Design a protein around this ligand. Structure first.
Ligand SMILES: [Mn+2]
Ligand SMILES: [Mn+2]
Lengths: 280, 280
């Protein structure tokens, strides 16, 4: 099952994706997040009976546009850990992206002048929570996963490493409003092969390539760790980390310039494609 | 003016505080956060005409129990930073506390076994946002402040510094479920003057002390800095940082034990008083 948030001329719906450009409206929900608040969301999706829609890629909204929590994971692929001069961790690294950072999977990333100096890509697999998860053990955690999608953890590296200078808190470089493409839609775990290639492209050149089963901490381990600190609600998002090949780590160093496009693709999940636009 | 969220048996109300133990119900709102979503909240509050109530300390809820954002600041007291022999920062340190962390100003902090090893206090002022703030200049920022309150940025120091070892992301030690006392009520800026003492007490012994007008980054500066990255909505909260005297920095290191109380008082705003209780 594939669930999308679709906006036709500014108006959003929750929709069952039927093909690359057709969907069935699921009545009574503005978006997939609202749907996931219902315990019978799978049933409602299986009985979609609203307007039939034909959609362009730019009409896809952030698949869950208003999660209460987007918990981002740092340093969760060996190759990324190595390139950033770090040790293989004993403990998951967590930091927060506010939902104001989310954009549609094909939306332009409009960057203001003060934020445009060190723009970087981080292609990541997202996990979407299907019901309230509190103090959940790893062995039970898969029950709490509604499905998966793709996100760009779109980064302002100069803000990310600003403060404090010695042990910078990354949050301010990881939550630029309207920066993080999210979709194209949520795939349920019954409907793709977990573990496939995560690939990122800048202006059509492949800059990231790693299988998702090289994750150091599994979605299940991430749910156990996070949920012994605070709960995750239906519709909340875990962003499981980026593999190697980020622009900040490259020889030579490479940042996103005006008009450049970052595509992120995960085998079985589809892709997002976001053009950076420097503000007027 | 002073605004409280008060639990009344199976219900909760927004109220205008009349005395330390009385208030006037503000009709049509469950909490101060809901009230702040109205354009004319200030008027609705001044003209409160609902039922007079008598409340106990333990019936106060978190003054804004469901903010969308709690943005917490790092080092922010100038004379504290200078006496550690550090430079004043030019850029704010920001990290996120999830609203699941909030409790009432007199609530017990109930802690599970895995979190109870390095419990520490941070007495701070809270700034509550009064209307939507996006790209607000420092000169204009006072207009966006609804008022002030007190928070304990209650910390699990072992979690805070866990990962990654060399530049730890504090979030996981700053967002423990049901940890952070918040209130006792919100004071409007016309009824508060900066300069008074912020003090924290452990078991009635003073452990922190600073004048409130010794900030590196004013509420106004923080609103400008934050709102050029993402918006703040009515009812969102900036927690403006803690001075010296935290348990973790002491010799010997002094963490909160089972049954111990932390009082955080700011002259002109009131105080909060939270007893730590290890869960059985
Ligand atoms: Mn990332
Ligand atoms: Mn603090």
């Amino acid at each position: 099952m594939r669930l999308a948030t679709i906006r036709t001329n500014g108006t959003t719906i929750a929709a069952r994706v039927e093909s690359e450009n057709t969907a069935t409206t699921i009545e009574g929900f503005a978006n997939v997040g609202e749907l996931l608040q219902e315990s019978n969301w799978r049933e409602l999706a299986e009985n979609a009976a609203g307007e039939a829609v034909t959609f362009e890629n730019k009409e896809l909204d952030a698949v869950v546009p208003a999660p209460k929590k987007i918990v981002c994971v740092g340093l969760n692929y060996a190759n990324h850990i190595k390139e950033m001069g770090r040790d293989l961790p004993d403990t998951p690294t967590l930091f927060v992206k506010f939902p104001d950072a989310l954009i549609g999977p094909f939306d332009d990333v409009v960057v203001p002048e003060w934020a445009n100096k060190a723009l970087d890509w981080e292609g990541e697999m997202a996990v979407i929570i299907g019901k309230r998860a509190r103090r959940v053990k790893q062995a039970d955690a898969a029950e709490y996963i509604a499905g998966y999608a793709v996100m760009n953890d779109y980064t302002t590296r100069d803000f990310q490493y600003a403060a404090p200078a010695k042990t910078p808190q990354w949050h301010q470089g990881k939550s630029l409003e309207k920066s993080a493409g999210f979709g194209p839609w949520m795939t349920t775990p019954d409907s793709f092969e977990f573990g496939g290639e995560l690939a990122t492209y800048l202006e059509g050149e492949k800059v990231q390539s790693t299988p998702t089963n090289d994750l150091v901490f599994s979605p299940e381990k991430l749910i156990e760790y996070i949920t012994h600190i605070y709960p995750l609600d239906a519709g909340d998002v875990i962003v499981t980390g980026t593999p190697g090949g980020v622009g900040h780590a490259r020889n030579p160093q490479r940042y996103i310039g005006d008009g450049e496009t970052v595509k992120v693709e995960i085998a079985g999940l589809g892709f997002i494609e976001n053009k950076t636009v420097f503000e007027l």
